[PDB]
Ligand binder design. Sequence first.
Ligand SMILES: NCCNC(=O)N1CCC[C@H](C(=O)Nc2ccc(Cl)c(F)c2)C1
Ligand SMILES: *[C@@H]1O[C@H](CO)[C@@H](O)[C@H](O)[C@H]1NC(C)=O
Ligand SMILES: *[C@@H]1O[C@H](CO)[C@@H](O)[C@H](O)[C@H]1NC(C)=O
Ligand SMILES: *[C@@H]1O[C@H](CO)[C@@H](O)[C@H](O)[C@H]1NC(C)=O
Ligand SMILES: *[C@@H]1O[C@H](CO)[C@@H](O)[C@H](O)[C@H]1NC(C)=O
Ligand SMILES: *[C@@H]1O[C@H](CO)[C@@H](O)[C@H](O)[C@H]1NC(C)=O
Ligand SMILES: *[C@@H]1O[C@H](CO)[C@@H](O)[C@H](O)[C@H]1NC(C)=O
Ligand SMILES: *[C@@H]1O[C@H](CO)[C@@H](O)[C@H](O)[C@H]1NC(C)=O
Ligand SMILES: *[C@@H]1O[C@H](CO)[C@@H](O)[C@H](O)[C@H]1NC(C)=O
Ligand SMILES: *[C@@H]1O[C@H](CO)[C@@H](O)[C@H](O)[C@H]1NC(C)=O
Ligand SMILES: *[C@@H]1O[C@H](CO)[C@@H](O)[C@H](O)[C@H]1NC(C)=O
Length: 340
Amino acid sequence: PVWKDADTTLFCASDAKAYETEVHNVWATHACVPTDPNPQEIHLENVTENFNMWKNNMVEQMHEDIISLWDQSLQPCVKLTGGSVIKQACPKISFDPIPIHYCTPAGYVILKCNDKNFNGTGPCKNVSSVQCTHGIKPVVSTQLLLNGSLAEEEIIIRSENLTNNAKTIIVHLNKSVEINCTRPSDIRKAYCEINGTKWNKVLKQVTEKLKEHFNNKTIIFQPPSGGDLEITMHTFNCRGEFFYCNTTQLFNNTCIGCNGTITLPCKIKQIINMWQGTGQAMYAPPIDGKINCVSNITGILLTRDGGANNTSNETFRPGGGDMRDNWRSELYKYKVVQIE
Ligand SMILES: NCCNC(=O)N1CCC[C@H](C(=O)Nc2ccc(Cl)c(F)c2)C1
Ligand SMILES: *[C@@H]1O[C@H](CO)[C@@H](O)[C@H](O)[C@H]1NC(C)=O
Ligand SMILES: *[C@@H]1O[C@H](CO)[C@@H](O)[C@H](O)[C@H]1NC(C)=O
Ligand SMILES: *[C@@H]1O[C@H](CO)[C@@H](O)[C@H](O)[C@H]1NC(C)=O
Ligand SMILES: *[C@@H]1O[C@H](CO)[C@@H](O)[C@H](O)[C@H]1NC(C)=O
Ligand SMILES: *[C@@H]1O[C@H](CO)[C@@H](O)[C@H](O)[C@H]1NC(C)=O
Ligand SMILES: *[C@@H]1O[C@H](CO)[C@@H](O)[C@H](O)[C@H]1NC(C)=O
Ligand SMILES: *[C@@H]1O[C@H](CO)[C@@H](O)[C@H](O)[C@H]1NC(C)=O
Ligand SMILES: *[C@@H]1O[C@H](CO)[C@@H](O)[C@H](O)[C@H]1NC(C)=O
Ligand SMILES: *[C@@H]1O[C@H](CO)[C@@H](O)[C@H](O)[C@H]1NC(C)=O
Ligand SMILES: *[C@@H]1O[C@H](CO)[C@@H](O)[C@H](O)[C@H]1NC(C)=O
């Protein structure tokens, strides 16, 4: 086998149920084929292959699909786009993301990096060959990566360029921390409950590894100062409702009487600034009854402060906004090649 680096158009696969009215299922039913009934991963003996997750067309290809999925699935009362106005009907929908596999057409194959502490760029010593990735959930998230994969060994610090502060940092956790968000039976007041013990343990480890990457320096956490509500809050979609949660308690540099349950204040918003960058959208009020989503915190989005080269500290705040990094967090060990 001999290959070369190449971009090409991918296709998708799913376990989607054709009887479901859930929108991820309805979209995967007509845009994707069924998942590979006999998937086989094959090792590449004595092969070293270098990867670059910040340099992967797979990401932008998935991004186009999630844009597609949201525009056909989400029914907004009125669509406020670039100097435009549209008025429609906005019934409530069934919303729950399902895993999606990304697969190469003929002449192309996917290379899988299996080195347990691969950071996302550079040489991979344990390389695989697959026809499709594994099932990736398209979770649209800010500040915190939800329902993803875990790093198998240590916590991984991923970044295209650690010395550039504009570059986003992806923290790949090795132990998931549960986030339990509930709007109980304001109709827009909600809260997310987190294990403080579990949470502070893991964030202590996150700081000890950023210490390794930044020359033993003091690692400070801080809430985002300024930006849109989707940036300064942990924003996610639970069962169709847009949750905005205040995470200041999570990035508490201190509980590093504070090892119980952390309860984050949340509000469901009807008017959101779309992650697709095209403007404002207005949706309908929340459904009646108890609205609950439990998810796994599996990764953290961070931006580092600048102007601290002559200081003794480094400051990191929760990031968000560019959903590409969310897909990048799960496609990092994949790249497409052209077989020669
Ligand atoms: N480093 C990139 C700067 N990002 C940026 O400029 N954006 C434009 C304005 C806010 C946009 C957004 O994140 N929207 C959103 C909507 C719903 C959910 Cl659930 C969610 F998690 C997020 C992103
Ligand atoms: C390579 O990765 C595989 C799959 O993750 C795993 O069995 C092990 O870590 C590695 N195996 C060899 C033979 O290097
Ligand atoms: C990732 O590993 C490569 C070596 O392959 C190194 O050059 C790069 O600085 C590392 N990046 C991070 C963020 O650790
Ligand atoms: C949450 O994480 C555990 C392991 O940490 C895993 O077994 C479980 O399936 C995860 N749940 C979801 C919804 O991903
Ligand atoms: C997670 O990684 C840290 C180092 O980053 C390590 O100390 C810890 O033991 C790991 N935890 C698990 C459950 O692997
Ligand atoms: C990373 O960013 C720093 C500061 O922005 C810059 O000086 C450096 O050349 C960049 N390195 C690479 C490899 O792009
Ligand atoms: C999530 O929280 C609600 C109320 O806060 C509680 O009733 C439920 O048992 C919790 N679920 C889990 C899995 O912790
Ligand atoms: C937090 O996790 C610990 C283990 O780290 C566990 O014993 C305990 O049940 C959890 N506490 C809460 C309040 O969820
Ligand atoms: C960083 O601190 C650790 C503390 O365990 C020490 O072992 C290491 O030599 C230090 N390295 C640098 C570059 O300061
Ligand atoms: C989050 O809560 C703190 C107090 O707990 C408050 O000062 C801060 O303004 C809140 N964040 C936002 C974005 O409103
Ligand atoms: C994460 O997965 C669980 C189980 O599938 C689900 O209940 C929860 O709503 C998911 N979280 C998000 C943010 O989609």
